[PDB]
Amino acid sequence: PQITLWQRPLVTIKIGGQLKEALLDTGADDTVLEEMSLPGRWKPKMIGGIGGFIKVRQYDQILIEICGHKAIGTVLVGPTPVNIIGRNLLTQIGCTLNF
Amino acid sequence: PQITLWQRPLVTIKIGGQLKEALLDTGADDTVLEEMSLPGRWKPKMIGGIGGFIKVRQYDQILIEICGHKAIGTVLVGPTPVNIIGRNLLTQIGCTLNF
Numbered sequence: 001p002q003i004t005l006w007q008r009p010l011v012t013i014k015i016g017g018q019l020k021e022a023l024l025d026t027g028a029d030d031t032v033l034e035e036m037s038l039p040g041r042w043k044p045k046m047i048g049g050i051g052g053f054i055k056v057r058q059y060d061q062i063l064i065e066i067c068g069h070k071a072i073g074t075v076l077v078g079p080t081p082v083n084i085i086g087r088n089l090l091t092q093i094g095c096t097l098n099f
Numbered sequence: 100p101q102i103t104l105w106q107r108p109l110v111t112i113k114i115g116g117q118l119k120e121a122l123l124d125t126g127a128d129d130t131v132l133e134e135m136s137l138p139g140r141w142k143p144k145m146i147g148g149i150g151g152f153i154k155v156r157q158y159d160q161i162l163i164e165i166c167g168h169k170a171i172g173t174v175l176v177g178p179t180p181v182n183i184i185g186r187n188l189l190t191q192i193g194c195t196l197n198f
């Protein structure tokens with residue numbers, strides 16, 4: 001699609017057989033989802049933003065589908081206000097910024 | 100221009116005839132710049148992110164220019180580690196997400 005930015009670029013993702021909404025976020029390096037159980041082993045990790053650092057769990061090599069496009073990569077799960085799709089997965093689906 | 104997401108989408112902005120660099124960020128609602136003293140009237144504000152909130156000063160009607168494109172709007176100033184161009188100014192420059 002072409003997405004304009006008059007509103008938040010929220011899309012539907014499919015992950016772990018769940019449907020969620022998530023924000024397509026060019027300013028995030030990483031992908032951060034709200035707390036959930038995923039299959040897999042995980043490593044504790046820290047990530048930061050405005051306001052500080054949070055503790056998250058890192059899951060590697062996770063399959064996610066964003067608007068019908070598949071991505072396989074690292075997902076962090078932790079106490080985020082909103083599900084964030086970062087540049088690690090946006091690049092896999094061929095996302096660009098245009099103007 | 101088409102900006103790819105392999106690297107962080109940092110561009111040059113001009114604000115007050117200063118060049119700076121800034122992150123084009125579709126996940127930010129607002130624009131947030133590193134501490135600087137602008138003329139103008141301000142309001143105190145709090146903005147949140149990953150690890151919590153910071154305190155900023157809000158200036159309205161600021162002209163910024165982003166890759167030769169002018170935009171005019173609200174800018175928040177405070178102790179951010181990076182300059183962030185948010186959706187309030189990205190929309191004005193006609194910026195889209197495409198995949």
Ligand SMILES: CC(C)[C@H](NC(=O)N(C)Cc1ccccn1)C(=O)N[C@@H](Cc1ccccc1)[C@@H](O)[C@H](O)[C@H](Cc1ccccc1)NC(=O)[C@@H](NC(=O)N(C)Cc1ccccn1)C(C)C
Pocket residue numbers: 008023025026027028029030031032047048049050081082084107122124125126127128129131146147148149180181183
């Ligand atoms: C999500 C994490 C992994 C991300 N961090 C990083 O990517 N890094 C720390 C790497 C880095 C280092 C240096 C330079 C650039 N990047 C982040 O917080 N990114 C911020 C920008 C930023 C980068 C570095 C340091 C500080 C800040 C931003 O790109 C991202 O869009 C976040 C996402 C988010 C939204 C809501 C709540 C929590 C996170 N937005 C924000 O932090 C903005 N807030 C909002 O827009 N809102 C709270 C409104 C809102 C609410 C709900 C949904 C959307 N918007 C700030 C900049 C104003």
